[PDB]
Design an enzyme around this catalytic site. Sequence first.
Site, PDB file in Angstrom:
ATOM      1  CG  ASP A  82     -23.336 -23.108  -2.049  1.00  0.00           C
ATOM      2  OD1 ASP A  82     -22.380 -22.680  -3.084  1.00  0.00           O
ATOM      3  OD2 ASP A  82     -23.776 -24.028  -2.152  1.00  0.00           O
ATOM      4  CB  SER A 141     -24.499 -29.252  -7.680  1.00  0.00           C
ATOM      5  OG  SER A 141     -24.034 -28.395  -8.759  1.00  0.00           O
ATOM      6  CG  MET A 142     -24.956 -29.465 -12.513  1.00  0.00           C
ATOM      7  SD  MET A 142     -24.121 -30.191 -13.945  1.00  0.00           S
ATOM      8  CE  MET A 142     -25.600 -30.670 -15.115  1.00  0.00           C
ATOM      9  CG  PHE A 182     -19.791 -29.477 -13.189  1.00  0.00           C
ATOM     10  CD1 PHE A 182     -18.965 -28.595 -12.647  1.00  0.00           C
ATOM     11  CD2 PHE A 182     -19.701 -30.175 -14.238  1.00  0.00           C
ATOM     12  CE1 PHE A 182     -17.770 -28.241 -13.386  1.00  0.00           C
ATOM     13  CE2 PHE A 182     -18.507 -29.766 -15.163  1.00  0.00           C
ATOM     14  CZ  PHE A 182     -17.850 -28.779 -14.613  1.00  0.00           C
ATOM     15  CG  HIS A 194     -21.303 -25.921  -4.243  1.00  0.00           C
ATOM     16  ND1 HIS A 194     -20.841 -26.064  -5.465  1.00  0.00           N
ATOM     17  CD2 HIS A 194     -22.601 -25.732  -4.301  1.00  0.00           C
ATOM     18  CE1 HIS A 194     -22.001 -26.639  -6.367  1.00  0.00           C
ATOM     19  NE2 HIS A 194     -22.664 -26.444  -5.310  1.00  0.00           N
TER      20      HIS A 194
END
Lengths: 440, 440, 440, 440
Positions: A228, A98-99, A32, A257
């Site tokens: 992160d 991530s997602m 995202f 991140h």
Amino acid sequence: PFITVGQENSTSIDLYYEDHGTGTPVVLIHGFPLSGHSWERQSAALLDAGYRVITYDRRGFGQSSQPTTGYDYDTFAADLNTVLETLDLQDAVLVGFSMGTGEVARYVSSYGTARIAAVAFLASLEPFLLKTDDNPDGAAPQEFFDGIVAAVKADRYAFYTGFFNDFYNLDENLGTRISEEAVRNSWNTAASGGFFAAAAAPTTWYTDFRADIPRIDVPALILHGTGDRTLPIENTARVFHKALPSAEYVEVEGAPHGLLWTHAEEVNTALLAFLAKAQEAQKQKLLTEVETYVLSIIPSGPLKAEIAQRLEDVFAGKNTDLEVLMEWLKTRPILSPLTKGILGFVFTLTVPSERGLQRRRFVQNALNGNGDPNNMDKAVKLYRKLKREITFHGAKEISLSYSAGALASCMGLIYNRMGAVTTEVAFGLVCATCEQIADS
Amino acid sequence: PFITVGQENSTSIDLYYEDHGTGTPVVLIHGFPLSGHSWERQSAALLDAGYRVITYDRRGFGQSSQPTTGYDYDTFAADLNTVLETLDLQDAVLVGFSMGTGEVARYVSSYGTARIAAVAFLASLEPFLLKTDDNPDGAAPQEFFDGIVAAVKADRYAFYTGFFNDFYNLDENLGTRISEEAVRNSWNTAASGGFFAAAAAPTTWYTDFRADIPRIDVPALILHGTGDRTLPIENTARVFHKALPSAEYVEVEGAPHGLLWTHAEEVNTALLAFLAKAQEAQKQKLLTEVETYVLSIIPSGPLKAEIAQRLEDVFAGKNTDLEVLMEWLKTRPILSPLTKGILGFVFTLTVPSERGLQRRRFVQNALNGNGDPNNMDKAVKLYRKLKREITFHGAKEISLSYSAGALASCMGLIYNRMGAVTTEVAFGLVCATCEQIADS
Amino acid sequence: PFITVGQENSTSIDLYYEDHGTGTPVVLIHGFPLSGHSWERQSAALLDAGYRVITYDRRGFGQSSQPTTGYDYDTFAADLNTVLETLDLQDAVLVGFSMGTGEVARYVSSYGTARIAAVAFLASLEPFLLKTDDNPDGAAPQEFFDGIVAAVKADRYAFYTGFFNDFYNLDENLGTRISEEAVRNSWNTAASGGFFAAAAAPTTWYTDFRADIPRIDVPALILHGTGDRTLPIENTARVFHKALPSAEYVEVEGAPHGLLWTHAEEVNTALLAFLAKAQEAQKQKLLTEVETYVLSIIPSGPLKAEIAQRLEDVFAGKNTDLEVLMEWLKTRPILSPLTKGILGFVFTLTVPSERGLQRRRFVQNALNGNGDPNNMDKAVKLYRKLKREITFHGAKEISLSYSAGALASCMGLIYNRMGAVTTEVAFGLVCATCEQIADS
Amino acid sequence: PFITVGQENSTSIDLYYEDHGTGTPVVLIHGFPLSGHSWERQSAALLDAGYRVITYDRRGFGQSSQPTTGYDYDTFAADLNTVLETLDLQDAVLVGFSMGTGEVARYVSSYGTARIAAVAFLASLEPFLLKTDDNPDGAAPQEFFDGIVAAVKADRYAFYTGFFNDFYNLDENLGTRISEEAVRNSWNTAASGGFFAAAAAPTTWYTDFRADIPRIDVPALILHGTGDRTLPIENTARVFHKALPSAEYVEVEGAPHGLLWTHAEEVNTALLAFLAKAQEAQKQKLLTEVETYVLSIIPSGPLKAEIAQRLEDVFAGKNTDLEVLMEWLKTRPILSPLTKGILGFVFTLTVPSERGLQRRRFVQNALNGNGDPNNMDKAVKLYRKLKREITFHGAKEISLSYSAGALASCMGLIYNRMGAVTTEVAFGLVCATCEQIADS
């Protein structure tokens, strides 16, 4: 390039994917609020290593359709499945970010590692973000996530600039590890996404992936940045590492991140090495499978042991002179001419260098197929089907429909440079031929 | 082994034949009153030279049926025709002895040299034995032959001993050129024959073969013994030599009528040499015709001269190292890959020794036919037709119906040992391919 | 018998033609307002001279379809072409009468004399009937033709009696050169025609054929009656004679327009003599073509010259005694029995008189075809096809599909009066037989 | 709007094109790293002149697919070919910019100017960018390009801003000739492009187009900016002008590489002037070709000279009285009525004023087509096809399939105002008609 993964009212839901290169398929699922294009640092790297890069944009992001329904990982995984099944990928590797890491876990858990050979989790969500009493390892309480969703609903466009400030750690990496222009592009990408997806997606970050982890059986990789901010290293990867100790664990020092761009150097090295160990794995399980099929048509004796030994030597990397092997092969007593041809066909396939050695005579006369026109007509018809094949099991199973005489002719048809098929397909044709002989 | 060639009452007329060895078929027709086994001296010689020996016993002789009808050369030829057509012989050689020479001439005259490649007349009857006013070259008047038939009818068993006494010139050759036991076998064979055929056959000896001789177009051989008592050298072969000057003429000094045994050394040497010269003759007219077709696709220049020179060199017998030629061929600039493939395909076909040289890679990739499945499907259909073809003009003309891409693929189909056709047929495919290129 | 030459709405335009006899094709195009049956005086004469008479009825006349469109010489020629091309006539002769003369000129001009060997113009319209300032040689002014069209439109049935009164010059010829009944038939033919064609046709009489005449290259004939009232001798044929001086010119004294019946005596004599020069020429090219084929199976020598000489003698008219030729033929050494049979078959075919000579025995045994049932089964199959054949090239080309043994048997099949084919066809069978022998 | 030009892994290579307006097709090929939308300054201008503007995005740029294969001018041209052939363009003009000029040169070189009428090279790459010993006219050495590729791979997004600074010469033209917003949009377009294409494209800039230049036969235009930093005027256009002197040469003073926007004023004027003069040029080449085609059915003589002169007079502008020409035309001896009709049809078409002159009678009766219903049925079918035609070559080539009689009838079908077609189409029908007559 799109792939229908659902239907909404009169319309159907399409996801913009992208498939390049040739070789071991490596699916890259983004995070995202970017798109498949964010993998470009890895895409270039993976492609230069001879891999097959496959990327797609999640629903409501990138160039994919922007629905107002189905923003949960059960759907996200179901979407991924449709992509995989449509492309008919085999021995593929799933790399998530991530997602994306959530999509990987949920798919593996629900659908199983049938097509999957290995998995990779970059900047993982696993095992659980939501901080509760029963899950104290959680990163943040419910209120935190609700705050994000409300902020996006307020002004999603203004949210992005603020969001990307912790995504790349701009107070540290801007101007050095990530350019001003590079961030500007990410904002546009974030803006191009669906307004509804932007607000719906954050609620999916605190999904409970604890039940999914035990289903991971294929070799895994857990990479993560120590710096992160969005996903705290201890609340994410380190607790994930406990739930999956067998997985190769990598911590990139001082990475934000969005390490995919800022620390692309380290991520690529770790990712390529992980795939290398996996690529050799899928290559070796194939060679041994070919071996067992070939040995299944050789009468038990002292010769069968040598042949198996000479196959293992070339499979490993102890490159014997191809000329020597062929010379040895031809001058073997108690060995069927058809069997010598099959072996010779395998040795040419497996030995790394051809060493300018012309096509062996004893093999051609062995795989000629009795010179019967009918056998060749069957062989050509099969060759047409084997041309559009890319997978071992796929090529092998469709070859079993043809007679042993047709299979033998088709094998020499490829040996004589009259036909072209991928190495996996050729192995499939060999195993299918040996399967016919083992029956009689 | 028998072959039905007619029918008589409740019975069927069968002829005991014998087919051995592999190669160019050589049909051997015996004389009176022996059988096909009388060729045993020649059979071994021809078999040792790699020929395919086919012998049969004439009706009423040897192990053949013994009918009381059809003792004329029109019938004798019809019998031979059935044999040839039953065995479906092509490019065959007819060798006749005594009565046999008549069968050969009559067959050629009546049925034509479609299946015949060459002929040989040993101890010929030609052109005419009967001595009349219009044929003064005749050996003996009507009264003489009528006397033989009566002699046979009196006591055929006693007739034989007297007959064989002048057949082998036993007053000269017994104990030296022919053993006592060998003659005894000839007598038994004579007795085993049909009683009716024994008396009927002599009336056929004075058949007028003058009309048959001009029909002999294939290369011929006229061998004869000077000491032939049954068939005087001057009344038979020497006058035959005038009626057929193109035929190779051989006179064995002091050889009896049955020189097949007494002078087997000379007869074999002369016969083997003749077949060698005839095989080479038709081969050279073939190779030069192939040459002009090959040159028709080469751009006029100093390179065309080199290729034409290298073709003439191998055709003649100046055996160049096949490895050297192929090496030279590949490294030629301004030469189409398809042309290199055609040339390489021709050089492998014509060069006597393959010298353990494996099939050249550059030729295979040239005749692959673009690896297109459609090209090969057409190629297989063509190959099926080329298998049942044996003649140059026949194979070439049916090949011109297929596309140039299919022809090229079909050529490599043979080059890669996946298909088998006679050399003459292969040349037809080459010439047909060059003809397609010569149009563009 | 009809021939589609066009289409008109739901119906099709068909022309009733008629093809009789065998030999040089002579197309007879009728005039106004009769039909092909008006040629019956010439047809019988031409048939008795061995010609092939082909007549057809022009559209809107006789038994042809009666369309109301396409009444012009550009269409009239297109119709004739379709007829000619449908029958595939070669070396044909076009003979026209009245209107018919226009079709001939226009066809030759537009389509060319490819299939045409000679032409004939009886009672010509050429070069121009319409009398104008630029064409003072015209027969009549514009008003004249228009008056005729109106007269026909008024009462075509009553018009005919008046028309035919000047067509045959009944004031002179009735009762003498043409019977009362003969005229009555012509009236019915005029009445049987289409009502529209009767009025449409006259407008085509004043067609300008001046542009067409120079295209006539083949030998031509211009016949005309001096007492021609419909077409004045000076305004038509004499001015045509100036425009075509090379053409053979004939003026019948005191002949009306319909000289075809009244002066059939003169017309036939002049037409047959003109056609005679053409008939012998194309007849001779056939015999010589047969000769060269026959000589192709005879061994080169002094005998080949004699046979060629005796063939030329009979072709010319030096009728040698058939018995003498056969006697000489049979008693020839170095001549194949099959060759004797073919020759014997040719001599019987060409010699005008059979002279009560029964079918030669040596020929029957030569063309028996080895007595094989299979050869006769093939021979009968060919004879069935040769029965419906009429042309040399046509019979010859379909015979080449059968084996030489079948051809020989089929030849004897005709020789023994068991089969019937036209002489041209028989020659085709001979040449087809000789062609097969020349191959072996 | 897309057009498949290839196929890749499960996906298809599609290129987003754009076709607007009606008239002469003008293909606009963009440069690096923009898209077809960069032509917007030229697009609007060309549309206002009544042209047909066709633009498309090169693979890996704009809205086109972004493959990782096929980045060479042989592929780029193959892509361009598919576009042209799919739209079936005729008499089209190819305009290239930056990279675009290479596609133009390669297509013309390999595929030929069959569909092409003229070409234009704006900011050319030709003849050779790579600086070597054999090519000292090169702009920069190899190291330079490798530096660019490395720069792009590092950070392509940051690369663009630096690139566009020299693309538009922003230190001079910003705020004046190009706004800040205009540049920002160009960057976005650059970012939208494929990551792989961005790095691959620079390697194609130093392609050797020297072999391609001699293939340019159609009228060409070479425009270039003097202040071009990316492509130095002397190393690109001035040396290109030497290799192609026939091409119209235009140097825009002080123009950067992206003159399409900064100096759109000058570029528009030069391009429009170039396109207007070339169609008129070929129109004079057409009229003389039309003249010669009309003359090709006219017999050589003093009359042919007059007709040729009167055609040249009206084509130029020496308006002769239409009535006088028609009066002269009809009263011409030795001139076919059909020829008079064709000429009369042309004179009415070319003469600017009709002067209230009613349709000539002698022309109608000449192009009536014999009044045959069949001729008119074919004419109507042809007229239907000629109506949807707008181009000469398009109309001419589809008319050649119909008979000469149908073409003549179809011409009169338009003459009698029963049909309406554009002037170019009508001329196509005339040339197609004259072409059929010239054969006979």
